[PDB]
Design a protein around this ligand. Structure first.
Ligand SMILES: NC(=O)c1ccc[n+]([C@@H]2O[C@H](COP(=O)([O-])OP(=O)(O)OC[C@H]3O[C@@H](n4cnc5c(N)ncnc54)[C@H](OP(=O)(O)O)[C@@H]3O)[C@@H](O)[C@H]2O)c1
Ligand SMILES: NC(=O)c1ccc[n+]([C@@H]2O[C@H](COP(=O)([O-])OP(=O)(O)OC[C@H]3O[C@@H](n4cnc5c(N)ncnc54)[C@H](OP(=O)(O)O)[C@@H]3O)[C@@H](O)[C@H]2O)c1
Ligand SMILES: NC(=O)c1ccc[n+]([C@@H]2O[C@H](COP(=O)([O-])OP(=O)(O)OC[C@H]3O[C@@H](n4cnc5c(N)ncnc54)[C@H](OP(=O)(O)O)[C@@H]3O)[C@@H](O)[C@H]2O)c1
Ligand SMILES: NC(=O)c1ccc[n+]([C@@H]2O[C@H](COP(=O)([O-])OP(=O)(O)OC[C@H]3O[C@@H](n4cnc5c(N)ncnc54)[C@H](OP(=O)(O)O)[C@@H]3O)[C@@H](O)[C@H]2O)c1
Ligand SMILES: O=C(O)[C@H](O)[C@@H](O)[C@H](O)[C@H](O)CO
Ligand SMILES: O=C(O)[C@H](O)[C@@H](O)[C@H](O)[C@H](O)CO
Ligand SMILES: O=C(O)[C@H](O)[C@@H](O)[C@H](O)[C@H](O)CO
Ligand SMILES: O=C(O)[C@H](O)[C@@H](O)[C@H](O)[C@H](O)CO
Ligand SMILES: [Ca+2]
Ligand SMILES: [Ca+2]
Ligand SMILES: [Ca+2]
Ligand SMILES: [Ca+2]
Lengths: 254, 254, 254, 254
């Protein structure tokens, strides 16, 4: 018989990568509010300290680790520490990422490769590191933060789009390969999200979006909790777009 | 600040079409459990009486109406009655449908047209009938029950696939056209669902599905509540597949 | 060993529905230039006479018939006449269609149903009528003229989008069901095509399109010949978009 | 006015990467037959010598170079040599690739990264190297060899699927970013192709495929020539699947 308790993350541990601020912080905050214990990593101590204070201010007793997501040995060690200090990771959110804006033919091979490493290879490293324990626990969730660039291209973001497209298929592959072990791997694909770090451009976004507003990180919270919960146990290899209708809409024409 | 209350349908009224048994009944039951008031229709009194008893047995005080979903005048009148006797419909689930299995070249034009009328035209009639009041209430949800046949074809189900493909685009169109009025129109696309009314075929389904089991109507409840709730307010024109990984998977090969 | 002759339609007969002017005329003209014999239908004698003169002026000896595509008995009789007077139809292009622009809630059920009948049901009627002879000939092609509205919605075009979405799935279904009989059924999905019957709107289209121009009916000719030919024999249930990059592009932002 | 000459590659130079045997060789052979001058690269002299002899036997005067596609400096130098010895590359086919079959959690980070480097990063390197000259010539084509794994996952092929998914989005990005410079970048996505280097598995493939046969490299020739030619000039950011209907079909059930 259905219960709203199917949405609850009580008793579960979630690792959200790069969750010191922004979208990762918002998803982790919502997870905590839904009942979860929060663990997170970032590239330096300063960012970790920032996230730790922000969690504390929100009433959340988070566990923060310095670790590069592209460092497999580092990640494996971090997961080992989390398991001994906190418990088994039930839910992984691959949120850590970078973006570069550079005309493709101007982009150096090193810079292209670096965006691929963090945005595509790293979610494989982290997923790889958490999956064995999820299988033994008898249930896992892996939520990959995708993008509208998992679907559509744009000048200057070639590396990013290639990575997010790859991450979309990595999601479908993990679902296919580990679905039988009761791992659900899905994507959240944010539309246009109004960040601190961001008019004709405003009119442009508003026109493209049926909802007729920018999204906010708060719009991602419900969808992210749904995918981390028992309420989505038969949702697998699926990219949940949270874009107020952008991907469905040809656009507001004159 | 996030709350699990975003998943609650307390204080809301949902119309689920054809919800006397099966998947419609399961979605309506879950909606009631999530807090909603349930209204539903079916083609004859007998089916309505069946649904009414089943709701009562589940502890749900449902409101049932005899109405053909392809009868616009009938539907408009029914919505008028629901508004006077129960209240404004906040949530519509276009669940009523038929399927026929007939080689396409053997299918009569009347039979093709009939599957189209019920499975595609009727959800437009019903959506049309509820949208004006949703706009005035300041929020609406329309959930269209799609299919894997919204994406993939099969021998014998030409009319059904054409209808479900159409319903997929009708969903994206309603999102595009009414998203600005705070209507979210989305799809639920069930995978293989074990019904009462249904081994090498068993092996076939199990192999195709990463989850390695048939779905059940219970698997649709969490996804359907999510789409009817405030937790998905920035999800629009989106087809949520609930298939245990089928659409993501090339298949279990020898 | 590969030959460019794989693109040739020499010795083949093509039926293009509604091919008296516009996109249908351009596809039929190209088919004739590629070697094909052209047959076509339209709703009245006047349109047929128009197409007949235009073909003659282009050096093409076309065969024109008055027939409503929603009239199955009429279509079956027309195919019977074409078979006795011209030969077996090797290639069908479902091009005939209508569009209406009407806010969905303002659209009458009759008008919705009429767009569905012509744009979705009729291509099933016509496909049904040609498939038996294609199977006996040992090869058939059916090209369905889809739209960007097979993928994306817009205000005022609800019925049209629902039909084109349906037509997309009808294409995939015919492929699935008749592919084994050596029928290839595919779609052509035109982007923005500059028609006679059509500035900030100009800037809008140009920005949305990587190619940075309106498409023209001439842009559809190569893709349509490819799909009607031996060069695409292993292409089946596929929607070939011809849009200069629109569907791939998030858009030219400020 | 349409001509079949729109399919001709006369007067054009094509670079097909890794085209010493297999699918690359078949596409290059067809390109030569369509009128093109053939250049190709492979990882060692032995493979190059093999391709060179096979071209000669087919009546084709190919130009072969030893170059690793992941070596940007090497690729840039090779393109410089091709330009001085042969001419400007009008058409690039990113065909070079590797596949590994390894359960994801068993896959080393080095091996994952290597499949990504060759199958995703390398097509960016090669595209980057040819685009400036294409722009100056006033027309370019880039055809990326994708896969059904650009769309669907499977056990053991996580890295490959992630790369091909990425390559799909890289294609759409190049289209978006360089479409205005009259570059058309598209994908060919082969279905199941019977290779030398390859029964219940036979029954499995035959059932999944509406065409009810394995594909062959010859099935890719027409689609590949179409995408390299003037006949597809308004086709951009598009993945042309050549799979006999697999992606359109739910499967042949018992
Ligand atoms: N509009 C949007 O914001 C938007 C839209 C769609 C999708 N997304 C995706 O949403 C996710 C997060 O978005 P956001 O904008 O809030 O944050 P964003 O700038 O990606 O940063 C995410 C976090 O990842 C961390 N990080 C970067 N590289 C790392 C590494 N190698 N190892 C460990 N941590 C690393 C960052 O540290 P630093 O402070 O040093 O960078 C940052 O704290 C990303 O996957 C992004 O691509 C964002
Ligand atoms: N495996 C599955 O069951 C599956 C998988 C994917 C999608 N779906 C979709 O899920 C939805 C419901 O599935 P289901 O299998 O539980 O039920 P299903 O047999 O479609 O029946 C749904 C209800 O619709 C009613 N109905 C039919 N025509 C009507 C009309 N013209 N006016 C009003 N009501 C009408 C039916 O009455 P009757 O008893 O007289 O038919 C029945 O009570 C449908 O849209 C279906 O296409 C089902
Ligand atoms: N921008 C575009 O033009 C565009 C873009 C994407 C897709 N398409 C699609 O391309 C196809 C043709 O486009 P178009 O703009 O050149 O022509 P369009 O106006 O659809 O007209 C096509 C032809 O269909 C005929 N027709 C309509 N209903 C019929 C019926 N019931 N029986 C027989 N014939 C009928 C029309 O006669 P009437 O003169 O009486 O209408 C006309 O000659 C259509 O499927 C359309 O939806 C067009
Ligand atoms: N069933 C299929 O065959 C199938 C289906 C779908 C897609 N595809 C795709 O079609 C393309 C070619 O298929 P295929 O099976 O004929 O060949 P495949 O084994 O990928 O080999 C392609 C060629 O790429 C060369 N290559 C590998 N790494 C290279 C590098 N780093 N630098 C330069 N060249 C390199 C290979 O040399 P080596 O001999 O040393 O490996 C080989 O000659 C690939 O992109 C593949 O992923 C194949
Ligand atoms: O060029 C850009 O800035 C990108 O397109 C962003 O606007 C994306 O929308 C976002 O980073 C998606 O993930
Ligand atoms: O031929 C059939 O019976 C259909 O393919 C069903 O099995 C569908 O899976 C279901 O009705 C989808 O909506
Ligand atoms: O509202 C409109 O006029 C439609 O959106 C057209 O512009 C379409 O682009 C074309 O008819 C597609 O088939
Ligand atoms: O595991 C495998 O062997 C792969 O799935 C192949 O069968 C693919 O079909 C082909 O390599 C696609 O590119
Ligand atoms: Ca985005
Ligand atoms: Ca289904
Ligand atoms: Ca269109
Ligand atoms: Ca493949």
């Amino acid at each position: 018989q259905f219960s709203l308790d199917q949405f609850s993350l009580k008793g579960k541990i979630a690792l959200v990568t790069g969750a010191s601020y922004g979208i990762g912080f918002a998803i982790a905050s919502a997870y905590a509010k839904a009942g979860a214990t929060i663990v997170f990593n970032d590239i330096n101590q300063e960012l970790v300290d920032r996230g730790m204070a922000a969690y504390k201010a929100a009433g959340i007793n988070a566990h923060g680790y310095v670790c590069d997501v592209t460092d497999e040995d580092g990640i494996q060690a971090m997961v080992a520490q989390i398991e001994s200090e906190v418990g088994i990771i039930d839910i992984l959110v691959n949120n850590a990422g970078i973006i570069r804006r550079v005309p493709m033919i101007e982009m150096t091979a090193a810079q292209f490769r670096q965006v691929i490493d963090i945005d595509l290879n790293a979610p494989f490293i982290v997923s790889k590191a958490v999956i064995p324990s999820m299988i033994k626990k008898g249930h896992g969730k892996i939520i990959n933060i995708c993008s509208m660039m998992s679907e559509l291209g744009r000048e200057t973001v070639s590396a990013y789009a290639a990575a997010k497209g790859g991450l979309k298929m990595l999601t479908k592959n993990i679902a296919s390969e580990y679905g039988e072990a009761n791992i659900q791997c899905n994507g959240i694909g944010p539309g246009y999200i109004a960040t601190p770090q961001t008019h004709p451009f405003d009119q442009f976004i508003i026109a493209k979006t049926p909802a007729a507003r920018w999204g906010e990180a708060e719009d991602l919270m419900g969808p992210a909790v749904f995918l981390a919960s028992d309420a989505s146990n038969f949702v697998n290899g699926h990219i949940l777009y949270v874009d107020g209708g952008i991907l469905a809409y040809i656009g507001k024409q004159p």
